[PDB]
Design a protein around this ligand. Structure first.
Ligand SMILES: OC[C@H]1O[C@@H](O[C@@H]2[C@@H](O)[C@H](O[C@@H]3[C@@H](O)[C@@H](O)O[C@H](CO)[C@H]3O)O[C@H](CO)[C@H]2O)[C@H](O)[C@@H](O)[C@@H]1O
Ligand SMILES: OC[C@H]1O[C@@H](O[C@@H]2[C@@H](O)[C@@H](O)O[C@H](CO)[C@H]2O)[C@H](O)[C@@H](O)[C@@H]1O
Length: 752
């Protein structure tokens, strides 16, 4: 028919006739559509299509747009594949001073072009295969084909020809500084070092000219870290080992909190005896966390400078990283020294709030706000109020998770639809190109999961598969599915090697893909942990823990640069707002002021936000730079978010600021976000800051054998917080020796 039943809910299988609610705005109306009809993929690539990847423009554009398989940038064109490396003289830091924006980026250049000897112009470039982080692009022209295999973290580009041979074309003649017949080392006229490898017996010609040629039907290109014969020889050892498979496998240790990820390639040999291995180029978030047994394969002097700092080479079939999952909570407990009747008052005030739009995002922000208040209402003994908040969440979700009306016809808004062409669940009304570009599904659907996790915490019946849980589990599968999911691609949002989520479904930019709100990604992963725990789904929980923890490790390098090794000295801000494959911006997608270019990577605040306080020196440095640029603590917007962030290191200051201004906000005022950001409340703000004043600093040096906890430390006095979703009492062991018993369906708090 028109819809598929999933428990008590349903999703549409036919595109609905949208009810626009009388809005003429061309923007809003254009959001209510589908992603592109044409997918540039070969007949070998079948089933739900992978999206939100560093390589996506190859699947969407007839050729490709500019891509960043670090350390390279590349792009597909009719004439062949252009290859480029951003050297220091290509890199700039640009500024719009009056806008207060900053931009770190390079050039869209060409060092050379990989061509096919028999074809001046290919008709298109398609995705021919892909794995966890490499892609195979296929340039095609009847019998003539050129298949290029490349990847983030790969300093090789492997090229396979059909009915033709290899040509490397240069605008200016390169210096060929090592000619070993079938292997050459060369430099561009502007001193960038590369190597090309053909099979033994197939020699290079055109030395001294603008065009190097080889009769072989296979070559590899390598970016060399230095002009150096020893490196050239090392690269030669693995140049005939073409990557066919690449897998990021992970485990979560329930006793230690350790997330262990093993990155493994499988290669096919192009010459006899070629080893099963490659040379990886590791990003900072990987080599900073390399397992002991992987340190021996690291090539310390094989470095590449890229937008994300220094990459370091590592040789072999596999390497392993080890991270520490720090725990999450469903909310903060009742431990602050707030005026309780004042907080109760703020909870009543919040009934006045309403969604500021009909789309999945604004509705998400609203339900996140309700889900945040319910546990605070419980803690304050306002059980009527808490039930009213959870009642409204049910009502909103039972509507949105049902595609059909009473008579079985499709609704025209507040529903989900399965786009079969790509293989994705789309929500209408849509915004931020969630439907048209398959953008931001974790950001949006994360709030729906937040709502469902809070309901599930209190009402297991509602959350059962046959009830409303099935539809919730479907939205989750859309943005973070496991392997071999019939409807969706694996881990849609996440790039396991780059270590972060990519927000754009199509990636059709010359800076590659991008991510703005890393905090909204972490919010999605947090809420899936909570939901999985509330509904008894260990596999789902552990996958969300792996995502949470890996994303954390990348936020600390590329958004915050906590170790001060990534951002160039002349970049003024203490944060990057938007990370792209090939660039970094201090800027927002909408017209914003100063605070927002920081705080969009803090919000929303919730029980998984404590990762933001792991590096107190960074938190002080970032706040101070924002304060200096503002010129005071008169925040241009979102004051409450700045107060809550400041509370991670100076809760006295946070409190003083809050007391001075919080009660200049009355009831919900959608048009004024100066004091309270519209996805937040006074109650949340007051509860958060007072709790942190009592608890002290987040303490990441203590782990536990349970996933739902937090440890705080206030001048040597630790507080231990645990929540038990199970109907069995548990004992939780902390790594410092502390122990606590927690009853079914509740918090417990200990001190030491
Ligand atoms: O305050 C009025 C002002 O608010 C703006 O709303 C912004 C959102 O635009 C912003 O969207 C983010 C996206 O850029 C993105 O990173 O992914 C999600 C959405 O999919 C968001 O993080 O989010 C912030 C915080 O929620 C909002 O304040 C309006 O865009 C703007 O027109 C309006 O004038
Ligand atoms: O790229 C993902 C990002 O897209 C933003 O919208 C932009 C839009 O503002 C404009 O520039 O057009 C492009 C497509 O050409 C859109 O991608 C979304 O606002 C943002 O939420 C999303 O993460």
């Amino acid at each position: 028919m028109h819809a598929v039943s999933v428990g008590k809910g349903s999703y549409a299988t036919e595109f609905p006739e949208i009810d626009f609610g009388g809005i003429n705005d061309p923007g809003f109306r254009d959001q209510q559509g589908e992603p592109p009809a044409t997918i540039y993929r070969s007949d070998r690539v079948t089933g739900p299509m992978q999206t939100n990847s560093w390589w996506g423009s190859l699947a969407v554009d007839r050729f490709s747009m500019n891509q960043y398989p670090h350390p390279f940038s590349v792009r597909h064109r009719a004439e062949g594949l252009h290859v480029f490396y951003d050297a220091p003289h290509n890199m700039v830091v640009h500024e719009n001073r009056e806008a207060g924006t900053w931009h770190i980026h390079g050039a869209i250049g060409t060092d050379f072009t990989i061509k096919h000897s028999g074809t001046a112009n290919f008709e298109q470039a398609v995705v021919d295969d892909y794995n966890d982080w490499y892609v195979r692009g296929l340039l095609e022209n009847g019998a003539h084909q050129m298949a290029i295999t490349y990847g983030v973290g790969s300093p090789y580009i492997f090229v396979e020809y059909e009915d033709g041979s290899a040509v490397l074309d240069f605008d200016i003649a390169p210096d060929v500084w090592e000619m070993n017949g079938h292997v050459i080392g060369f430099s561009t006229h502007d001193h960038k070092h590369y190597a090309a490898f053909a099979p033994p017996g197939q020699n290079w010609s055109g030395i001294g000219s603008k065009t190097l040629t080889n009769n072989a039907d296979y070559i590899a290109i390598a970016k060399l870290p230095e002009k150096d014969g020893n490196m050239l020889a090392k690269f030669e050892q693995y140049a005939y080992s073409v990557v066919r498979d690449a897998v990021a496998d992970w485990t979560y240790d329930e006793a230690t909190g350790t997330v262990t990820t093993t990155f493994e390639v499988t290669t096919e040999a192009k010459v006899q005896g070629a080893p099963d291995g490659t040379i990886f180029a590791l990003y900072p978030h990987q080599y900073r966390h390399l397992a002991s047994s992987s340190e021996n394969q690291l090539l310390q002097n094989y470095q590449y400078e890229i937008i994300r700092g220094t990459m370091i080479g590592l040789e072999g079939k596999r390497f392993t990283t080890e991270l520490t999952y720090p725990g999450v909570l469903p909310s903060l407990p009742d431990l602050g020294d707030y005026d309780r009747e004042r907080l109760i008052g703020y909870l009543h005030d919040a009934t006045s709030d309403y969604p500021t739009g009909s789309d999945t995002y604004e509705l998400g922000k609203y339900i996140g706000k309700l889900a945040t208040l319910a546990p605070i209402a419980d803690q304050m003994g306002e059980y009527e109020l808490a039930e009213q908040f959870r009642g409204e969440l049910k009502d909103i979700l039972e509507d949105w998770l049902q595609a059909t009306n009473a008579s079985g016809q499709l609704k025209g808004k507040n529903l989900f639809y399965y786009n079969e062409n790509w293989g994705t669940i789309l929500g209408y009304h849509a915004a931020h190109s969630s439907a048209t570009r398959i953008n931001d599904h974790h950001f949006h659907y994360g709030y729906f999961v937040k709502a469902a996790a809070e309901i599930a915490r209190a009402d297991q019946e509602w959350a059962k598969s046959e009830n409303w849980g099935g539809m919730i589990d479907l939205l989750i599968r859309d943005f973070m599915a496991d392997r071999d999911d019939d409807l969706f691609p694996y881990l849609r949002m996440f790039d396991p090697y780059s270590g972060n989520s990519w927000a754009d479904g199509l990636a059709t930019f010359d800076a590659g893909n991008n991510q703005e709100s890393s905090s909204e990604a972490m919010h999605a992963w947090t809420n899936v942990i909570l939901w999985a725990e509330a509904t008894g789904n260990k596999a789902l929980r552990d996958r969300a823990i792996y995502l949470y923890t890996t994303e954390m490790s990348a936020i600390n390098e590329y958004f915050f640069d906590v170790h001060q090794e990534i951002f160039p000295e002349e970049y003024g801000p203490e944060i990057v707002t938007i990370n792209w494959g090939g660039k970094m911006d201090h800027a927002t997608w909408w017209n914003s002021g100063k605070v927002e270019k920081y705080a969009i990577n803090w919000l929303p605040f919730h029980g998984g936000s404590l990762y933001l306080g792991h590096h107190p020196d960074y938190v002080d440095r970032a706040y101070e730079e924002l304060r200096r640029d503002i010129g005071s603590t008169d925040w241009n917007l979102w004051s409450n978010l700045v107060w809550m962030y400041r509370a991670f290191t100076n809760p006295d200051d946070a409190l003083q600021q809050m007391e001075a201004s919080i009660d200049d906000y009355g009831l919900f005022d959608p048009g004024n976000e100066k004091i309270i950001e519209r996805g937040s409340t006074k109650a949340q703000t007051y509860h958060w800051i007072h709790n942190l004043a009592e608890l002290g600093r987040v303490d990441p040096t203590v782990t536990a054998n349970h996933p739902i906890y937090a440890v705080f430390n206030k001048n040597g006095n630790r507080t231990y917080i645990v929540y038990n979703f199970s109907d069995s009492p548990i004992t939780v062991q902390f790594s410092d020796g502390h122990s606590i018993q927690v009853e079914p369906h509740s918090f417990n708090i200990g001190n030491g």
